[PDB]
Each structure stands twice: as C-alpha cells, then as structure tokens.
Amino acid sequence: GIALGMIETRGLVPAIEAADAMTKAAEVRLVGRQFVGGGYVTVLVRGETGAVNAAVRAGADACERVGDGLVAAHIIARVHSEVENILPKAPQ
Amino acid sequence: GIALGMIETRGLVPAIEAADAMTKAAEVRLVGRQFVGGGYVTVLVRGETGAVNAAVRAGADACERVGDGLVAAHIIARVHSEVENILPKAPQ
Amino acid sequence: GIALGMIETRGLVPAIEAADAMTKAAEVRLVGRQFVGGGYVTVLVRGETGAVNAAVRAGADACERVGDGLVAAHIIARVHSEVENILPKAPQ
Amino acid sequence: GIALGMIETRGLVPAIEAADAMTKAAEVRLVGRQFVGGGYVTVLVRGETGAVNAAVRAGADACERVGDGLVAAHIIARVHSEVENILPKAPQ
Amino acid sequence: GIALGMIETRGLVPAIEAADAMTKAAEVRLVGRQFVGGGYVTVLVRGETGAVNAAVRAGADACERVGDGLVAAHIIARVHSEVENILPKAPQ
Amino acid sequence: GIALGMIETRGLVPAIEAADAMTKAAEVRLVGRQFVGGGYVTVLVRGETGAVNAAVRAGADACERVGDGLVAAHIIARVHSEVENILPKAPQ
Amino acid sequence: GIALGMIETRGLVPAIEAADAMTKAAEVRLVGRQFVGGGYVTVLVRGETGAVNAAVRAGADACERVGDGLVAAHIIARVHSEVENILPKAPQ
Amino acid sequence: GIALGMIETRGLVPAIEAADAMTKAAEVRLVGRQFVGGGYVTVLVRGETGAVNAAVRAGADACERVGDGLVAAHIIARVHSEVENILPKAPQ
Amino acid sequence: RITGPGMLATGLITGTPEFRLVCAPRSDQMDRVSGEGKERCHITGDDWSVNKHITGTAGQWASGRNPSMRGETSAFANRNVPKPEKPGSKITGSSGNDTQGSLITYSGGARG
Amino acid sequence: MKIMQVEKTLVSTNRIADMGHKPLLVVWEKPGAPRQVAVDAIGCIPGDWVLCVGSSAAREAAGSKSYPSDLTIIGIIDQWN
C-alpha cells in the first residue's frame, strides 16, 4: 500500500511505543522516525489505507498515556509525488 | 514561476498535511522542509502567483486542525534575488 | 537482549542517574542515549525480559528526584521487527 | 557599506518575510540567516547606514504581523572590528 | 579517581561559573560540557569521592543565583562500566 | 587579560548588541559566541579585571532593551586552568 | 486478505445469519465455521481491513437478535504470523 | 525457553485474541490450541520465564472482555518431562 | 562544627549516601485521527467504522500490551517575558522619527 | 491608475516622521521616461511591472487617510510586457 500514516509525540518513548503498536496492529511498515526539534518526534508508516487507519488508531491509543503523550495522528491516503521527497523511505 | 508560498506549523505532521494540500491544489513545486527549531516546521513552494495563492490558501485551510496547528501562511509574489540564497532549491 | 527498556528524562543528569541505576540493577546492555531535543533525554537498554523489568523499575525510582525528574519509564518485552530499525545498537 | 542591520523573529516565515522586505527596501546585502535555537531566527544585512536604517525599518514593519511575529529590529551603524568575527559573511 | 559529579544549569553562564567553582574547590578534573538542548547545560567532573563531593557542593553553591539558575547537582561515586560509553572523557 | 566576562541573552540580536557594546566600552577581546539551545546565546570576553567590569556593565545596559533581553551578566576574575578547556579561545 | 473477522454465537442459526450478513456487506472470504463445543459457533472471515470492519459490523448487527444471540465480535487487522497456524484456511 | 504459559477461555474468539496478544507481547512461541469441551478453549505458549510472564499477563488482559471472557491464566516455569507427552508441540 | 566545602549546598546535592448537517461543526469537533481518518462527516453504508460492541485492534488491545509509568524554553514561550520600558526618542529635526511603527533599536538600545 | 516598472530603491533618511517605515521605489512608465517615487505597499523587486494609484486613494493605499503619499504601488501585474 501507498497510504501514509503519521503520529507526532512529545518525546521519543511515546514515539517508539506508537511505532510498536502501529506495526503490531495492522499490515504497515515503518518508514521513518524524525526528530522535529523542541521535543517533537514523528513516526511514519506506509501501507493500505484501511490498514493505515487501523494502525494509526492503535498507535494513538497506545501512546496517549505514555510520557508526555500524543500530539498528532494523521492519515493521507495518497500523498502527492512532490511530498514523497520530504518523506523518509526507510527507517534508520 | 518565482512566487514563494510558505506555511509554518507546530510539528511535522501538520507541515506534511499542508505540503500535500498545497501540491494537490495547484501547480507548485515543494522546494523545502525546514526544521526551524523549537518545534517550528516550514514548508516552502514555488510557482506562479495565482498557483501559489491557491496552494497557500488550501494548505492553510487543511493544516489548521492537524496536531498543534498552523503558525504562518504567507505568500510573496516576487522574491528578491538576495533571499534566493537562503531558500532551499530542492527538499530532502 | 530482546526486551527493550526505556527511560525519558528532563535533562541529562537524571538520564545518567537512571542509566547507572538500570545497569547496576540487572543484566541489561545500554544501547543508546538520545538527545531528543527540547531537553528530553532518553536512555535505552536491552536484555532479557525480567532483567529489563528490574532495570526499568530501578532506573525510574533512582531518577525520580534527580534534576527535573522523570518523564516516562517504559518496557516493551519484544518490539516489532520493524521497530528494530529505529533503535540504536550501541551508544555514541 | 559596513553598517549592520538585524531582525530576529519567532519562526522562519517572519524571518524570510523580513529579509525579503529588507532587501526590497534599500541597497543591503543579505549576509546571514541564523537558526538561533528554540524557534528564534535572525537575518542580518550589511550596507550603508542610511540604507540599513531604511531596510530594517521596512523589514520590521513587514514582519511584525507574520506568524509568531517580530522579536528584535536592531541597527549597528559602526560595527566594532571584534564583532566582525561572529558575524556571517555570506548566507547558506 | 572515578567518581562522577554533574551539575545541570539553565544556560551556559551558570554552568561555566559552576565549573570554575568545582575545579577551584577540590582536586577534580573537568571532563565534559554538554549542551543538552532546550537550554540545559551539563558539566561533568571526575575524581575521588571526597573531591567530587566537595566540588559538587561548591559548584552548586556558586551557580545557584547565576542567570536562570541551577537544575541538578548529583554525585555517583562509582558509575557502571556501561555508563562510561555515554560519558565524555575530555571536553571541547 | 585573564578575567572572563559573559552575558547570556534570549536570542542572537541582544547577544550581538552586547558584544558590540562590550568591545566598544573597554579593552576586552571577544573570544566566543555560543548558541546554547532553547534561544540562549552567550557572549564571552577576556581582559583585565577593571576592563571586564566596565565591559560587562556596558553590555548588560546596552542589551537589556534589545529583543527578548538579558538573562545573565557574570564576571569570573580568575578562571581556573581546568575551565579553559571549555572556554572558546577564538570566536566563530 | 490479511485482516481477520470473528463472530461467536450461541448456536448455529445466528452464526449462519452473521456469515450471510458479513459476506453480503463487504468483500470478505469465509475461511471457517468452527463448532467450538458447548453450543458456541465461531465464523471467521478474512479480507482487507476496511472490508473486514464493515463485514463484522453488519454481521454483529444481523445476528444480535437471532436465536440465543451474539457472544463476540472481534477484529484483528493483522494477526501474529504464528497465530495463522491455528486459523483455518477453508471452512470444512 | 522451557516455561509454559496457558490461557483458558470460554469460547474460541477470546482464545484467538489471547494467543495473538501473547505472541505480540513477548518472545514466546504458540504451541497449541485445544478445544476442551463445554466451550472451554486453551491456548499454550512456550518461552523464557520472564517472556512467558509478560505474554500471559498481556493475553489475560486482552481476552478478559472479549466474548465470555477468561477462565484461567497460568504459568509453569519448568515443565516435567512426563507432562510434555500431553502437550502439543506445533499448533494446528 | 567543621567548616569548609562540606557545609555548602545543603539541600541541593543528590546522590550522596544520606540522600540515598451531514458533517459535524468544525469548531467543536476534534477528530481522533485527522485527514483521511476523520470521523466528523457522517458516512452511511459499509464504511470502515467500528461498532461499540466490537472488540480488538485499537483501544485497550493496543495500550495494555506494554507496561508504562509516567513521571518550556523557546522563542514562542518567551513572547511574554518581562521587558524594560520601551526606549523613547527625544531628538528633533527631520530624521524619519516615526513613533507609531514597530520598535527599532540603535546602538546602546537607543530608539531609532 | 498607471502601469509602471520598478527601477530601484529610494532612501531619504531625513524624511518626515509621518511617512512611517514604508519603503520607497523609483518607478517610470518605461526606461527613459520621467522618474517618479511611489510608496511600495506590496514589496516589489526591480524590473517588476506594478499598478500605481495616485491622488487621494494613494494615501489610504499606503495605510491611513493622512499618509503623505500621492503615488502608491497597490499590485504587481501578473504578466506584462
């Protein structure tokens, strides 16, 4: 799938919990963890649109009560080709 | 076109939503995503004045309720050649 | 070390105290000290499940009262195989 | 040609708007755009004292109402030679 | 000596004052100065237990009312061998 | 000149103004400008004790009204040789 | 069809009604009807995540009032690969 | 590992959910699902003692409110070889 | 009473042995997941929404897996830091001495 | 209104305080035409073809009913030769 799901958190620990829950919940792959600055961490997943929806929902529910919690949960079913250049392809 | 559209958001998720909306709404090229610091994220587009106007309006509408939300949605019809030295040409 | 232990502190001194407490408590290997940004610091330990459990409890108790204090203490007994690509192997 | 003008903003978008307005107002060279940290951005211009004066006034007026706004609009007509060491010579 | 003394401050100025006080008070060596991010600055000293105790007490006393003040003043008489990987050996 | 004068400000513009005022007021060498993080910027000068006293007073007075203002004004009259490892010798 | 939909009923008649509603509502394949013992009957479907969601919703609604009623309506977007060893591929 | 974790449920759906939760929670392997009779369903996992404790806790919490719920959650840290004769080795 | 460095910083040191409409209104409806995951608009038919009596995937089945224990300095947070009185201009003659626009400072904090 | 091309910037340090911080640009209808100075309310670059309103409308275009301007740039032409 080509849909994109993202979770923004306050701190790395909720971000890692969100990534774990997202990958365990549905058929999605982790494509990047980004340190935004000022304490924000963003985790990104790709997959089928319904799988992405389930994964992001589970990640939000899992990371809400972890650390300083959840900032954003968002799904884009088909990202523009231009936006593909600001998205990490593989996690590192 | 040499017009510049800029959207500043709190966090990367609303910035990505804004970039997606801007690139879907008009013929503009995403030239940069900048981590300003303190959580500020800026997405910049270039194109014709009408296209940049439409793109910035659509992105500002789209990202206003995503995560911690929008900070600035600005348009410059003609960029001075001096400012071209501090503007990214391609994103990453 | 399959289990993952994670402690996030406000500042570096509670992170160092927590890492010392975890590594003294049980057989865990410290795999990362990440400067998240905005003052957040995360210490990550791997090990067997019971060792990581004991280490995380000890580290949370130790770094409770040091500096600006505790933010999060988290245990993941087995992260998803995707999550391993955003986890550090060794400290830098 | 040796006067220094400085505008500090909260966020990159007001800083870019201020630099654009400054270089449009008078004959000033944009010598630096600094990401201070925590969201502060500083744009620095060099030129004749009158040109720097007009440019800084126009830039402050233009960037006051953009994003999170303006922090500082400062003119140094005669820079001490020691301060030149910490001043940027070209942007990036 | 292998004991560890750490002082965390808000801003560089109290950290430098604390380092001066620590190295004046006792026979400790300054091994690091870390910019944690978010304004936090940590200075680390090594020495024998009594030297580290005296140095940390003196630094905390000296930097308490300097700038934005003191965050942490901590002593670890013997850090675990794992924690050595995340401790600077020399400053820069 | 062995004495050390430091001024910490919120934002770069007051720091540059403080450095200019300090170097104009008395015979002091500007040795560093540090981006602490979180918006803190520290400027360091070296010189004789009286020169450093005058310089720090002039810098604080000149930069208190600029931008987000002044955080700290500190003098160390006799810096320990250990502290010179973390003090910049030439500014960047 | 990665996702898994499960409906447990008391008796076979509500299970058959639930299976009919599930397969009519969305593109899901019925991969098993299991006589659990003691009167429990489980119907299991596979498909896309959104299709499975709609199917399970419809099946629960349909079989709620039939016979001795519904016991459980459960969805797993992606089971663990080991769990596939206890999941029927075809209904025998 | 050689420890044995068992979950007994009323119905098949909570048993499948428990098996999924146990496998996803910790480093354990699913070895069997047994229909007992009268509606009882038992899922068994094998692994290291700490991993088994974590997996059984997670599965018991997950299946508690699914269908007719949970009957028993038991951990045997070391299984006698005589009992291995009545234990499935591979799930079917 | 023994004097020296041991009497300093009492109550500050740690680590010592002693220490040890179809769509709901935009204003008052914040979505769980924004964008394509929005539930604001009432979609009829066979959508991917989940009923109340349906279990799994999200909810406690994602948050109960991993045990967890809970425990600003920036440009934005500094917009209301106390500042001294704004500098005034007492100069005369025509020098572009606008007093209504934004604050412009010259060397030493003078108004300009 | 008129169509004029921006030539260069104009700086007057000793200008009256009522002008505020607004920048001034030198405009002419074509190269070689008589030069005029407009208040730049848009932020244009040299070479831009702009729209300049005069008379009493220029005052409000520059910001207030009492602004000392009789020529203000109020737009940049999207495409002009």
Author numbering:
A (entry chain E), B (entry chain D), C (entry chain F), D (entry chain C), E (entry chain A), F (entry chain B), ...: 6 to 97
I (entry chain X): 712 to 731, 773 to 823, 829 to 869
J (entry chain G): 1 to 81
The article reads:
Carboxysomes are anabolic BMCs for autotrophic CO2 fixation found in all cyanobacteria and many proteobacteria. The carboxysome is composed of a polyhedral shell that encapsulates the key CO2-fixation enzyme, ribulose-1,5-bisphosphate carboxylase/oxygenase (Rubisco), and carbonic anhydrase (CA), which dehydrates HCO3− to CO2, the substrate for Rubisco carboxylation. In α-carboxysomes, the disordered linker protein CsoS2 plays an essential role in carboxysome assembly and Rubisco encapsulation. In this work, we synthetically engineer α-carboxysome shells using minimal shell components derived from a chemoautotroph Halothiobacillus (H.) neapolitanus, a model system in the fundamental studies and synthetic engineering, and determine high-resolution cryoEM structures of the shells of variable constituents.
The high-quality map of the T = 9 shell (1.86 Å resolution) allows for accurate modelling of CsoS2-C that tightly associates with shell proteins, resulting in an atomic model of the T = 9 shell comprising 80 CsoS1A hexamers, 12 CsoS4A pentamers and 60 CsoS2-C. Of those, interfaces 3 and 4 are unique to the T = 9 shell, whereas interfaces 1 and 2 are present in all three shells as previously reported. In contrast, the angles between two hexamers in interfaces 3 and 4 are arranged in a planar fashion, markedly different from those in interfaces 1 and 2, and also different from those measured in other BMC mini-shells. The cryoEM structure of the T = 9 shell at 1.86 Å resolution enables the characterization of CsoS2 and its interactions with the shell at atomic details. It is clearly well-resolved for the most of C-terminus in the cryoEM map, allowing unambiguous assignment of amino acid residues of three fragments of CsoS2-C: F1, Arg712−Arg731; F2, Leu773−Gly823; F3, Glu829−Gly869. The cryoEM structure revealed that the F1, F2, F3 fragments adopt completely different conformations from the AlphaFold2-predicted structures. They form extensive hydrogen bonds and salt bridges with both CsoS1A and CsoS4A at three distinct binding sites, with the surface contact area of 767.1, 3333.0, and 1851.7 Å2, respectively. Interestingly, all three CsoS2-C fragments, F1 to F3, bind specifically to the tri-capsomere interfaces. While CsoS2-F1 and F2 interact with three CsoS1A hexamers, CsoS2-F3 acts on the interface between one CsoS4A pentamer and two CsoS1A hexamers, with the extreme C-terminus buried inside the cavity formed by the interface. The three CsoS2-C F1-F3 fragments associate tightly with shell proteins simultaneously and essentially “stitches” the capsomeres together at the inner surface of the T = 9 shell. However, a close inspection of the interfaces uncovers a common interaction motif among these interactions: alignment of all the CsoS1A-CsoS2 interfaces identifies a repetitive Ile(Val)-Thr-Gly ([IV]TG) motif that interacts with the β-strand of highly conserved CsoS1A through His79 and hydrogen bonds in the main chain.
